[PDB]
Symmetry: C3
Subunit: 220 residues, 3 copies
C-alpha cells in the first residue's frame, strides 16, 4: 500500500464531495412532488372570476380544501397581512406554503405601482377582479389584463406591475421561495418599519411549513 | 466605595420618579375637536389662504405654542413609499401640529408608531384602506380621519390634496418611520436636516415658553 | 566677467520651481476649456424636432442624427440596452447614449407612469419630452407645473422636486456636473427596495461602456 499527499487529498476529497453532492442534488430534484399543477390554480380560479371577490375567495378556499385535504390552512390560521415591496403595497392571505410551492390571495383596494422583483420562481396571478398592467423589461409598451386572464411572471424576468383600484387575484408560485423572501421583506425593513407585519408574514410562512410537515409525516 | 456605586442608582430612581410624576401632571395645549372645527371652518377657502388664516387663529388661541413666520418652512417628507410636504406649526414630545399634503398625489403605508393622528382635510381627497379589510374609505374636504395607535393602513392622496394634522402620543417613536426613506430611498440629507431642525425649533419654543 | 555668469544648481532649482508654478497654473485651465460637446440647450432644441412622432421612430431617428453630428461620442447599437431604473420611490427605464464624468445623455421614461422624489445631486438635468406628460412640484410651493410634448424640464443643481410621469411618457435627458454624485443616489432603491442586483450590474456596465467609449475616442 501507499499514502497520498495532503494537497493531493485536498483535490481528491474535493472531487469526492463534488460527485456526492451533485448526485444527491440530482436525486433530490428527481423526487420533487408538486401538489398543484402548473396551470391548475388558474384553471380553477377562472371559474370564480367576476363574482364578489369575498364570495369568490370563500368558494375557492372551500374548493381547495376539498380537492387537497391537508395542504390548505384552516379557517383559524387565515389572516390578511399587508405586503410592501419594490415600491408597491398590497395585502395577501396565505392558503398554502412550503419550500417550493405557495398559494395565496393577493390584492389591493387602492391600486399600486412597483417593481415585481427578480427571483427564481414562476408565479401565476389569476385576476378575480380589477385590472393588471404589466411592463416587461426592454419594451416601451404596456399590457393590460382583466378579470379571467392570468399573468405569468417567469423566473429571471423583471416587470413593472400596476394594480388598479379593487384589484384582487389568486397567486400560485413554484420555485425557491426563500429566494423570494429576501425581496419580500426589503421595504418592510427599510421603509415602513412595520415589524408587526413582518412577524405576521413570518408566522403565516411558519404555519404553512408546519401544516406541510404534518401532512408529510402523518397526513390524510 | 460601593456606596458610591449605589448612590447613582438612588439618584436615578429619584429622577425617574420626578419624570413619572411630571408625565402624570401633564396637560395638552390642543384638543382634537378644536383642531377639527378650526380646519373645517377654512375648508372652503383656497388652501394657502386657509393655511394663513389657521396659523393666525392658532397664534391667537395659543400664544407661545406656535412657531413664528421666520421659523415656518415647507419641508418634504418621503416615508413608507409616499411623498408629500409639511409645515410644522407646533411640536413637543407629546403633541404636534402641522399642515400636510401633496400636489401630485401619492400612495403608501401609514406607519406603526405610538401615536394617535388626526387629519382634517382642507382640499383634495383622502383614501384609507384598513388592515384586514378588502374595501376602501374616502374622506372629502371638511372631514376628519383618525389613525389610531399601533394601527397600519394604506393611504392615498389625490392631486392637490392638503390637510391639517394634529398628533398626540409618543412623538419620538414616529421619528423612525420619518427618516427611513430619507436615508434609504432619497438620500436627501438636506431635507433630513431641515426636518430635524424643525423638530428642534418646536422643542425649543415649547421649552422657552414653559421656562421664560 | 562675473557679472553675467550664472551658476548651475541655482538654475536647476529655478527651473524646477518654474515648472511647478507653470503646472499648478495650467491645472486651473482644466476649467478654462470645458468644451462641452453640446452647446448648452442643444439636446432640447434637437429633440423638439422629432417629438411629435411615435416614440420609437423618434428615438431611432434621434440616435441616427446624433451619431451623425457628434461621431465617436455615441454608443453603438450593440451596446444600446433598456435598463430599469428605480430611485426616490419611482420607477422607469433608461437607455444610455453618452456617458462621461462631466456630462451624460440618455433616453428615459416609463409606460405605466410613476411618482417620486427627484434627488439632490450636483447636476443640471434637461429632460426634453417626446411623448406623454411631466408633472413637477418644486420645493417650498403648493402648486405644480405640467410639461407637454415639445417642452423641456430644467432640474437645477442642488434642487429637490416631486416628479410625476403619466402613462406612456418618453423623453431625452442631458445632464452636466459631477455624475458620480448622481450615480450614488441613482442606485439606492436598487439596493434597498427592488434588490435587483442584475439591474445594478446592467447599469454599472452601461456606464462603464460609456466611459470606455469616451476614453478610447480621446486617444484615437
Ligand atoms: C412540528 C411537528 C408537528 C407535529 C404535529 C403532529 O404531531 O400531528 C399529529 C397528528 O396526527 C396530526 O396529523
Ligand atoms: C407582484 C408579484 C408578481 C407577486 C406578488 N407576490 C405577492 C406575495 C409574495 C409571497 C410576496 C410576499 C412579500 O412579503 C413581499 C413580496 C411578495 C411578491 C409575490 C410573492 C413572492
Ligand atoms: C400618513 C399620515 C396619516 C400622517 C403623516 N404625517 C405626516 C407628517 C409626520 C410628521 C410624518 C413625518 C415623516 O417624516 C414621516 C411620517 C410622518 C407621519 C405623520 C406625521 C407624524
Ligand atoms: C428624475 C430626474 C430629475 C431625472 C431622472 N433621471 C433619470 C436617469 C438618471 C441617470 C437616473 C438613474 C437612476 O438609476 C436613478 C435616478 C436617476 C435620475 C436622473 C438620471 C441621473
Amino acid at each position: 500500500q501507499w499514502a497520498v499527499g495532503r494537497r493531493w487529498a485536498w483535490a481528491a476529497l474535493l472531487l469526492a464531495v463534488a460527485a456526492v453532492l451533485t448526485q444527491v442534488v440530482w436525486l433530490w430534484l428527481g423526487t420533487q412532488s408538486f401538489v398543484f399543477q402548473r396551470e391548475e390554480i388558474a384553471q380553477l380560479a377562472r371559474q370564480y372570476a367576476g363574482l364578489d371577490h369575498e364570495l369568490a375567495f370563500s368558494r375557492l378556499i372551500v374548493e381547495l380544501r376539498r380537492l387537497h385535504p391537508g395542504h390548505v390552512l384552516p379557517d383559524e390560521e387565515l389572516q390578511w397581512v399587508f405586503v410592501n415591496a419594490g415600491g408597491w403595497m398590497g395585502a395577501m392571505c396565505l392558503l398554502h406554503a412550503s419550500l417550493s410551492e405557495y398559494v395565496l390571495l393577493f390584492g389591493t383596494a387602492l391600486g399600486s405601482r412597483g417593481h415585481s422583483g427578480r427571483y427564481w420562481a414562476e408565479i401565476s396571478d389569476t385576476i378575480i377582479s380589477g385590472t393588471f398592467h404589466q411592463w416587461r423589461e426592454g419594451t416601451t409598451k404596456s399590457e393590460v389584463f382583466y378579470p379571467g386572464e392570468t399573468v405569468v411572471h417567469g423566473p429571471g424576468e423583471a416587470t413593472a406591475v400596476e394594480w388598479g383600484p379593487n384589484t384582487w387575484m389568486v397567486e400560485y408560485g413554484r420555485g425557491v421561495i426563500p429566494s423570494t423572501l429576501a425581496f419580500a421583506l426589503a421595504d418592510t425593513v427599510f421603509s415602513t418599519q412595520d415589524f408587526l407585519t413582518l412577524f405576521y408574514t413570518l408566522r403565516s410562512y411558519a404555519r404553512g411549513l408546519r401544516l406541510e410537515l404534518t401532512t408529510y409525516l402523518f397526513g390524510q
